[PDB]
Each structure stands twice: as C-alpha cells, then as structure tokens.
C-alpha cells in the first residue's frame, strides 16, 4: 500500500529525524519508484501518474531547499534532481 | 501560559441598555 | 484584476467603431509622409448624389451623397443643407457628426464653405449654409 514505516525507519537516522527533510525526500523517491512500478503494471491509472508528477515537483522543491540549507546534500548525491 | 497581560480588563455582558432615565 | 496580475494583464480601454478618420489625413507625391494636420473640413470630389429612405419610424426621402476624399477612404454621407447642391462630381469639404437614420451614412458635411455656398433666406444656419448677412 503506502509502503510507509519501513522506508521511514530506514531513512530515520536518529529519533531526531522522524519528519525531517531526509525522510520526506526518501519517501517521495520511494513513492516515485513504487508508482512507476504500479502504473507500469496498471496503465490507465491516471491518478497514479498525476500523483507521480506532483511528487516529482515536491521532490524538486525539497532538493532545492536541501541544497540551500545544507551544502553536503550534493556531495553524497544519491538523489539527483533529474526526473 | 501568561507572558504579558496588557490591561487585563476586558469588557463583558453588554446588556440592552439605552436612555436609562426617562421619568 | 489584482495589481500583480494587472502588471501582466494591463488596462484595456474602451474601443470605438470608425466615425471619421479620413477627414484628418491625406496622401501626396514627393514623400508620401501623410498629411498629419487633422483637417476639420477637407476637400474631395463627390461620386454619387441622390435621395433614399431612413429607418422605419422616421422615414423620409432624405438626401445622400457618396463622396471621395483625397486619401484612400471614400464614404457615404448626409448633406445637412436645405436641399442638395452636390451633383455627383462637386468638390466639397466634409464635416464631423454621425447620422443614425440613413444606412451607409455616418457623416455630415460643412454646408456653406468654399463650395456648396448660398442656400439663402435664413434666420438659423447662416454661419452654416453659407447664407449671407441677414439684410432686411
């Protein structure tokens, strides 16, 4: 379904990042992957594609912030803003 | 939690009142 | 609407349909730079003269004249003079105004000027009609 708790806790480095930028962007990226899988398995689900584009946009804005605030976001960039 | 009470008085109970003396 | 959008969608003033531009400009050889003088009464050669019917409530056999100005635009006009002194070729100087009765007509003509003078026997419209001084 949501694929929520496991991905959060994998991105949950400490007890001080339950809702941080890191876990949020990880959730959006994991949701992008899961939505691609689903919508390839379920073609005409336009809800999934519109949500995928919305998550892509919100991920872009989250990344622009994460590079505005912390300069170490792109030195270990496993979340490059290209999709 | 109280920080500052600038004139803690507050108006209340606006009765229907007008021209109290008519006698 | 709002100022932020108003910058991108500025104010759009009211527009008016053609009334009488041709009276103000005309062409000429040797530099076709237009005659930007805003002529109040501009000479031109008339083409047709006749009489026809205005609208239904106010019908008549009222005079009309298809006239041609120096510039490209030629137009059908009304003669505000008592009787018509235009003979389908008379040079005449035009006027402003608009006629709401005769179709095809949206103009008035200077009655009395360098041409179309002397209607005669007048108390009103002697500055117009070119009528002379009111000698007893």
């Amino acid at each position: 379904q949501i694929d929520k708790n496991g991905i959060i806790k994998s991105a949950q480095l400490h007890d001080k990042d339950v809702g941080s930028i890191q876990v949020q962007v990880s959730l959006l990226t994991s949701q992008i992957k899961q939505l691609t899988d689903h919508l390839l398995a379920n073609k005409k689900d336009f809800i999934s594609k519109r949500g995928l584009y919305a998550k892509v946009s919100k991920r872009k804005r989250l990344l622009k912030y994460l590079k505005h605030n912390d300069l170490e976001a792109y030195r270990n960039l496993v979340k490059t803003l290209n999709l | 939690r109280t920080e500052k009470a600038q004139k803690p008085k507050e108006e209340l109970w606006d009765v229907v009142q007008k021209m109290g003396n008519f006698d | 609407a709002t100022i932020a959008q108003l910058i991108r969608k500025p104010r759009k003033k009211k527009k008016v349909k053609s009334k009488s531009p041709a009276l103000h400009y005309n062409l000429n050889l040797l530099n076709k730079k237009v005659t930007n003088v805003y002529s109040p009464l501009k000479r031109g050669v008339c083409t047709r003269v006749g009489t026809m019917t205005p609208k239904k409530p106010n019908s008549a056999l009222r005079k009309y004249a298809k006239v041609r100005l120096t510039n490209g635009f030629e137009v059908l006009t009304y003669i505000p003079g008592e009787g018509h002194n235009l003979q389908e070729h008379s040079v005449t100087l035009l006027r402003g105004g608009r006629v709401k009765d005769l179709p095809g007509v949206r103009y008035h003509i200077v009655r009395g000027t360098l041409d179309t003078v002397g209607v005669e026997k007048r108390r009103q419209q002697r500055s117009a009609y070119g009528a002379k001084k009111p000698k007893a």
Binding site: - | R1, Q6, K7, E10, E11 | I3
Partner: protein, 141 residues
C-alpha cells in the same frame, strides 16, 4: 487563563489580523486571536492607547515555539464596536512606506494611522512631528 483557537501562518500576520478583525465586525464577536510579533505588539499597544481597540494579551507556549496574541474590541453596552474600519497597509506583495511629511489624518482629521519608522513605531501625528518616516502598518479610524 486559556486562550483557544490558535492560528498558524496564513500567509502573513497582517492579513491574518485583518480577516479576524473583519470577522469580529461581521459576527459581532468580542475577542479574537492572531499571530504575535514585535510590530503586532507595538500596533496593538498603540491601538489600545488610541481607543479604537480594547486591550490585548500576548501569550507564548514556552518560546518561539508558539507566540500568539488575543485581542478584544472596545464595545459600549450596546454591542457597538469602537472599530469603524481598519485597513492593513504593510503587505508582503507590496511593501508600502511613506515619509514623515506625507502622512494624512484619517476619518475627518480624527483617524490615526500607525507608522513604523527608522527608529520606532508610533502614531501619524507624532510621526510627522518626529521628522522620521517609514512603513505604515494600519490605517485606523
């Protein structure tokens, strides 16, 4: 005490204050809560002193964690508010400022505009007298 109905960042403190003020005027409501700020505290104190607005109480949870202000309008004993119209001037989309010599008296020479300047926040008359100008926060009459 217990201050109920907190408000979060709407888009700005000024519009958050204006919507509450107009809603109180509409529903004949007494006291409403909005955000807290140094400018808001200054204008609220000066409006208590001016008489257009009744008192206010600024409240905090523990820190910048949550800072709000509850404010009441001065009402006669007829449910008639003292506020006869307040217009916000300082806005996010339009930062409005005026010199000390270009500040008018509102209403009919009675209304008092609230003006923050280079060295403080005050009323329109003493802003003209101060020979120092700045942004305007609210036209009050």
């Amino acid at each position: 005490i217990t201050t109920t109905k907190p408000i979060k960042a709407h888009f700005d403190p000024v519009a958050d204050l204006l919507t509450k003020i107009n809603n109180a005027r509409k529903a004949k409501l007494m006291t409403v809560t909005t955000i807290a700020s140094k400018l808001k505290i200054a204008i609220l104190e000066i409006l208590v002193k001016e008489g257009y607005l009744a008192n206010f109480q600024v409240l905090e949870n523990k820190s910048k964690t949550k800072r709000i202000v509850t404010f009441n309008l001065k009402y006669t004993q007829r449910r008639i508010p003292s506020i006869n119209g307040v217009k916000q001037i300082s806005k996010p989309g339009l930062r409005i400022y005026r010199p000390f010599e270009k500040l008018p008296l509102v209403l009919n020479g009675l209304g008092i505009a609230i003006i923050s300047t280079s060295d403080g926040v005050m009323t329109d008359k003493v802003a003209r007298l101060k020979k120092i100008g700045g942004e305007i926060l609210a036209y009050v009459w």
